[PDB]
Every structure is written in structure tokens, then in C-alpha cells.
């Protein structure tokens, strides 16, 4: 914190205020829920008073599977963060009580890839990606959350310590310059979750952790007695040590194993329960 610091802050953000179209407010529980006099809609506000890189970089984007953040604003001393609300909770709930299916799994996954195509080419990377930054409405369709870690990368490469551990590329552990494909390695990772129901070495504490995720092997599968051949072949291509061995999001769209991704509805009982 720092006034300076928020002297780079102010001018790019909208300024006034939303309870100008907004106003029936509520605190909920996140913050607030007001509506549009103009036509309805409720929004939900995360309010305040490096995380320089959400307000900037994501400011400037839009996608169909990312909440989209409508607009900034602060008085005195405190930032106001019009959102996208959506009811229908995080994939966590999902995983760690039943077992999804390939229809089910096929969909998070590419729904998470049709995100990152888009987020990478224009040259950001999530670097938090796990079942836990993932949102979901209540109809069942499927959005890529929390850009608390992000940033812009010439600078074609980075190497910034952060994510969490468990979910983690080894070339960032490692502490080699990574690029993009590390958002490849967390879905490896998180597809792992979908079918196990966990990541890797989650029994450990995460220093030694990333140790192990630093010299061994790439992860296996504990289940594998209820995988089709394809998620094999689709899991054997993302799990690749040397980054440059590593699959591409454009290649993985083209993937078989995403023949059997399964409309929003469904995707809709699993939360149901």
C-alpha cells in the first residue's frame, strides 16, 4: 500500500460511480448484489480499500467463459469492482466427493482451452489453473476464474515464483524460464483431479512437494481401471517434462478424446447433488 502506487492506479479506471444505474445493494456474504433499473440484472461486487495486473491487463478483454469484470471505480480511499455474477459454485465441490465422467470431464476441459487459446495469443498467462479457479453458472456452463496471479509477457518469457505447488509446471519450479505452456502443465494436473479426485503428492506438504514434483517422473494415474485408452493419449501429451515436448492448446482442440465433451445441461446434476 502506498499513494504513489495508487497514483498509477486511479487514472485508469473509470471514474464517478455505479449507484448512478445501480443502487438495490445487499450485502451477501463477494460483498454485494445490486440491480439495473434498466433492465434488472443483479451484479456482484468484490470491494477494497502484483494485484496491479487484474485491474490493467484483464481490463482490456472479454470472453464467454471469463466473468467479466464491467467496470472500476473508487471514493476516498476504496476501489469499486462492477462484476459478473453467476450462481453455480467451483468445480472443487464437484471433485471431491463423486466421480466425473469423460462427457463431464471432456467439457471442463475444453471449455478451459477455448479460454486459454484466446488469453495466450494475446500473450497472458493464468499461472493459477486448478479446479478451484473455476466458476460455473447455475445452467451449467463453464467460465475460467480468478486472475490474482496473471501478467503481461521481448519478454516472451517469465519467471515469477507463484501459483500453488501442487498444481505447479517443474520448469517453474525449477526455476527455468517458462512461457505459457505452464497453464498446460496445471490442466494435466487438474484433469488428474477430475479422474483421481486429487492432485499428485497432495498427502505431502508442498515444499517437499515441489521437490517431487522436481525429480520424478510425470504424474500416473491411481484409477486408470475405469480410463478409456483416449484420456490416456489426451493425458499422455499434456504430462510432458520437457516443455518443448509439451502439446498446444490449438492442438488439443483437434484432440479425439474432446469427441465426447457433453452440452451445459449435462453437466447440470452433478451440482444438482
Known amino acids: 500500500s502506498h499513494e ?59 470472453h464467454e467463459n471469463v466473468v467479466e469484470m464491467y467496470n472500476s471505480y473508487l471514493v476516498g480511499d476504496e476501489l469499486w469492482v462492477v462484476m459478473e455474477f453467476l450462481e453455480g459454485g467451483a468445480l472443487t465441490d464437484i471433485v471431491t466427493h463423486t466421480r466425473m465422467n469423460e462427457e463431464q470431464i ?47 509477457v521481448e519478454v516472451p518469457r517469465r519467471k515469477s515464483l507463484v501459483g500453488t505447488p501442487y498444481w505447479m509446471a517443474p520448469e517453474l519450479i525449477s526455476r527455468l524460464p517458462y512461457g505459457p505452456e505452464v497453464d498446460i502443465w496445471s490442466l494435466g494436473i487438474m484433469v488428474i483431479e477430475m479422474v483421481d479426485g486429487e492432485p499428485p503428492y497432495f498427502n505431502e506438504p508442498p515444499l517437499k512437494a515441489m521437490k517431487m514434483i522436481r525429480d520424478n517422473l510425470p504424474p500416473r494415474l491411481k484409477n486408470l481401471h475405469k480410463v478409456s485408452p483416449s484420456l490416456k493419449g489426451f493425458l499422455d501429451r499434456l504430462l510432458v517434462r520437457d516443455p518443448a515436448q509439451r502439446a498446444t492448446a490449438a492442438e488439443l482442440l483437434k484432440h479425439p478424446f474432446l469427441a465426447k465433451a457433453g452440452p451445459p445441461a449435462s453437466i447440470v446434476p452433478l451440482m444438482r447433488q
Open 106 to 152: 471432456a467439457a471442463v476441459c475444453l471449455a478451459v482451452l477455448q479460454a486459454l487459446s484466446v488469453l495466450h495469443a494475446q500473450g497472458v498467462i493464468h499461472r493459477d489453473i486448478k479446479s478451484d479457479s473455476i466458476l460455473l453458472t447455475h445452467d451449467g456452463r463453464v467460465k475460467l476464474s480468478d486472475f490474482g496471479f496473471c501478467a503481461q
Open 4 to 62: 504513489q502506487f495508487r497514483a498509477a492506479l486511479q487514472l485508469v479506471v473509470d471514474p464517478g460511480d455505479p449507484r448512478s444505474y445501480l443502487d438495490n445493494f445487499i450485502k451477501i456474504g463477494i460483498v454485494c448484489i445490486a440491480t439495473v433499473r434498466s433492465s434488472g440484472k443483479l451484479v456482484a461486487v468484490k470491494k477494497m480499500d502484483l494485484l496491479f495486473n487484474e485491474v490493467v491487463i484483464m481490463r482490456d478483454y472479454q
